[PDB]
Amino acid sequence: TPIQQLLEHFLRQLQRKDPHGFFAFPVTDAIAPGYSMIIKHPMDFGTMKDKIVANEYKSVTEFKADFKLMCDNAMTYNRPDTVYYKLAKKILHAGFKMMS
Amino acid sequence: TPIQQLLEHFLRQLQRKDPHGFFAFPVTDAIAPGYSMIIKHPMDFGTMKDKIVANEYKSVTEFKADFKLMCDNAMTYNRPDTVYYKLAKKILHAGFKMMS
């Protein structure tokens, strides 16, 4: 589907912003204590890629809402001084601009 | 000395408020990622005991400032919903009331 090519391109330009892959995979409680008690709706780019390939998103709107979820999760759990918080903030705003 | 008697009692009373010994020993960056860069003046009950034994406090004001420093540092480093933050803020205010 044409929406799938569009979203794959956007997903690719977004992931390039995350060269360490902090957003690549699900966060586990093992590597972020209490993370699942605090974030009740997890998201990551690998799940968004599975979502595009499953034709789960019917619009850029729905895809942007998962990207937002993912950055809002990292800004909620991580302290502001961290690499994770600062990346999430940065990419939230830059990626919304890039998708418009 | 007699100040030592006084401070040893206040210490044992404060330390009973911490049955898991969250504050018994210095925090290390391995149990608390990023701790030594954020907290510039670490404190814990063990360090406070040794300062009593070593006669470093000259007044109860100086002891209460290291107690507050220990609770301040926990408030700062730990997210507010954490057992660590909770117990630091709770014991800071109760220990100051107890020792006045």
Binding site: P33, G34, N78, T82 | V27, P33, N78, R79
Partner: peptide, 6 residues
């Protein structure tokens, strides 16, 4: 690298 204590 990630989180606080726990």
């Amino acid at each position: 690298g990630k989180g606080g204590k726990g």
